Design a protein around this ligand. Structure first.
Ligand code: HEM
Ligand code: DCR
Length: 419
């Protein structure tokens, strides 16, 4: 079992970012390697379809307790679905997935579309529109409402900003960083606010619609017949739309891709299939989630080595979505590749792999793809705009993946036939 030796390589991981794992595999001449990180802890990094299958074998791999505490404290929340395994988890996961009905999915499609269409005058009005900001604000409205949480217009900028600080909070992979305390306070504000809405739903003082996150989560009972304590229920209710709001990352990359590859825009208009393909390729191609931590429950024999009981595991997400034996020219933006993709649950894993119900795979993959479809169709078809000179670098050596400028646009003008 090959090592990238060192007492702790955390700072090295942060310096190489999304290309750390690839650089070590290339340099050590192997598909599997160990590295100590997060304070002396050894992690075996596994990749590919074969890495993803094993990583989501629940007989062999534990997730419970393997997220760094600082990331639990800021991104996901204490006691979040992300932090439990086994029966307790499968039961709770069922609640999340129960929101993802055909009707709720069309509802998020319709909200996203209507708000974009409604937001054109405002965007014509601005000297310039930062798409990272503008989309996070617009998706805060979609996401609160989709979750049955009433958020006043007056409060959406504040809320959006608190979400942004949280979503970003994995940048130090669990280390100390200067924005950490601000991250914890944004979460506290958002948790208090959702806890209030839960307590008040349970008292019958407010009335979220049947089938919304707020309603289902407030009234749900676990497999022992106990409801979630109010705080944990607010934490998990957030886990139902903070990540929806975080799609702003992908809206921004979306516009970068369409701008770099202007051909994609025409095909978004010409081919009703293509918006789906484009959205999938934005998720595969661009960096967001670097890797996921787990731990070996027992020795595992994998790719000619033994992973010892107790060692850490890191499923390489960016590595698997850019694996040259899974995708021809993994570093070329090419939506048409998804004409052939067979729907495998172990290659396209930018929001996790495996099974929605039994593993920790993202609950909101279909919402992510739906929202990106409607957003990209909006930007391709209903408006024209200019892209001024700006820093459009996406630095693959810096976690998290952002377009440096946020992706700024000007001279927005609705596309209308007036003849
Ligand atoms: C926008 C970009 C998004 C990204 C990059 C993302 C990524 C991820 C990743 C990597 C995981 C963990 C996979 C694992 O632990 O094996 C995850 C889990 C999760 N995702 Fe997302 N997701 C996004 C959007 C969403 C949306 C829109 C929702 C809900 C509407 C959502 C809900 C969740 C939940 C509740 C979990 C934890 C599931 C569990 O622990 O069983 N995500 N996501
Ligand atoms: C090479 C490695 C050693 C491994 C170190 C383990 C690092 C653990 C950090 C895991 C990163 C999780 C990032 C998840 C992205 C969050 C989803 C965005 C949507 C949301 O929840 O808001």
């Amino acid at each position: 079992l090959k090592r990238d030796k060192g007492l702790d390589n955390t700072l090295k991981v942060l310096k190489q970012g999304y290309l750390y794992t690839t650089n070590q595999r290339n340099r050590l001449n192997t598909s599997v390697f160990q590295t100590k990180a997060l304070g002396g802890k050894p992690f075996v990094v596994v990749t590919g379809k074969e890495g993803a299958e094993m990583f989501y074998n629940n007989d062999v791999v534990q997730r419970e307790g393997m997220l760094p505490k600082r990331i639990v404290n800021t991104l996901f929340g204490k006691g979040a679905i992300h932090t439990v395994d086994g029966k307790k988890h499968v039961d709770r996961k069922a609640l999340f997935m129960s929101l993802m009905t055909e009707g709720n999915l069309n509802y998020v499609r319709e909200l996203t579309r209507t708000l974009w269409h409604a937001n054109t005058q405002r965007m014509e009005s601005m000297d310039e529109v930062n798409i990272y900001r503008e989309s996070i604000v617009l998706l805060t409205k979609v996401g609160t409402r989709w979750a049955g949480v009433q958020a006043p217009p007056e409060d959406i900028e504040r809320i959006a900003t608190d979400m942004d600080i949280m979503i970003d909070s994995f940048r130090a992979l669990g280390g100390a960083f200067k924005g950490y305390k601000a991250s914890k306070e944004a979460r506290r504000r958002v948790e208090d606010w959702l806890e209030e809405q839960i307590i008040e739903t349970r008292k019958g003082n407010i009335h979220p619609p049947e089938g919304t996150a707020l309603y289902e989560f407030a009234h749900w009972e676990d497999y022992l017949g106990n409801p979630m304590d109010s705080r944990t229920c607010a934490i998990d209710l957030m886990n139902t739309f903070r990540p929806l709001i975080a799609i702003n990352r992908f809206v921004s990359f979306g516009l970068h891709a369409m701008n770099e590859n202007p051909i994609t825009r025409e095909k978004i208009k010409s081919e009703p299939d293509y918006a789906y393909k484009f959205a999938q390729e934005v998720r595969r191609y661009y960096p967001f989630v670097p890797f996921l931590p787990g731990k070996a429950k027992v020795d595992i024999d994998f790719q000619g080595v033994t992973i010892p009981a107790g060692v850490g595991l890191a499923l390489d997400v960016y590595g698997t979505t850019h694996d040259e034996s899974l995708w021809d020219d993994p570093n070329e933006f090419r939506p048409e590749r998804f004409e052939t993709w067979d729907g495998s649950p172990f290659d396209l894993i930018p929001q996790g792999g495996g099974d929605y119900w039994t593993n920790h795979r993202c609950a909101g993959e279909w919402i992510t793809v739906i929202i990106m479809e409607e957003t990209m169709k909006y930007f391709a078809e209903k408006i024209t705009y200019d892209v001024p000179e700006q820093d459009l670098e996406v630095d693959l050596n810096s976690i998290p993946g952002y377009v440096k400028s946020g992706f700024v646009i000007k001279n927005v003008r609705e596309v209308v036939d007036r003849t």
